[PDB]
Amino acid sequence: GANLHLLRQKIEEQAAKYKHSVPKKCCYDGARVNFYETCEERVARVTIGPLCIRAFNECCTIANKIRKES
């Protein structure tokens, strides 16, 4: 299956680029598996704030790429 160590490491690395806790959490949340929707569909649902949205989408994108490169 997908390399979970790698996924965790890359998401940790990205989260470190955000200054504050809420965008870090948004990143982690975007990185969680979702079998039914793409990153664009998922982030379209989130309205917490623009930095949160950016983090969610970027981390979603990173995670899903690692999942598909299994």
Residue numbers in the entry: 677 to 746
Give verbatim lines from the article.
To assess whether this property was specific to the human C5a proteins or whether this is a general feature of C5a, we also determined the structures of mouse C5a and C5a-desArg (mC5a and mC5a-desArg) at 1.4 and 2.1 Å resolution, respectively. Both murine proteins fold into a four-helix bundle motif as observed for hC5a. mC5a and mC5a-desArg crystals both displayed P43 symmetry with very similar unit-cell parameters and diffracted to 1.4 and 2.1 Å resolution, respectively. In both structures, the atomic model was traced between residues Asn679 and Ser746, which corresponds to the four-helix bundle core, with helix H1 extending between Asn679 and Tyr694, helix H2 formed by residues Ser697–Arg708, helix H3 encompassing residues Thr714–Val722 and helix H4 comprising residues Gly725–Ser746. The overall fold is also stabilized by three disulfide bridges in both mC5a and mC5a-desArg: Cys702–Cys728 (H2–H4), Cys703–Cys735 (H2–H4) and Cys715–Cys736 (H3–H4). The C-terminus of mC5a and mC5a-desArg (region Pro747–Arg755/Gly754) was not visible in the electron density, again suggesting its high flexibility. Surprisingly, a blob of density that assumed the shape of an arginine was visible in the mC5a structure. This density is observed in the groove between the helix H1 N-terminus and the helix H2 C-terminus of monomer A in the asymmetric unit and is located within hydrogen-bonding distance of Arg743 of the same monomer. Inspection of the crystal packing reveals that this density could represent the C-terminal Arg755 of mC5a from a neighbouring symmetry-related molecule, in which the Cα atom of the last modelled residue, Glu745, is separated by 21 Å from the putative position of this Arg755 Cα atom, a distance that could accommodate a stretch of nine residues assuming a random-coil nonlinear conformation. As expected, mC5a is a full agonist of mC5aR and can activate the receptor with an EC50 of 0.57 ± 0.13 nM.
Upon complement activation, a cascade of proteolytic events generates the complement effectors, including the anaphylatoxins C3a and C5a. Anaphylatoxin signalling through the G-protein coupled receptors (GPCRs) C3aR and C5aR leads to various cellular responses including chemotaxis, oxidative burst, the release of pro-inflammatory molecules and activation of the adaptive immune system. As for C3a, C5a activity is regulated by carboxypeptidases that cleave off the C-terminal arginine residue, producing the C5a-desArg molecule which has a distinct bioactivity pattern and generally a much lower potency than C5a, in part owing to its tenfold to 100-fold decrease in C5aR binding affinity. Here, we have reported the crystal structures of the human C5aR antagonist hC5a-A8 and of the two murine anaphylatoxins mC5a and mC5a-desArg.
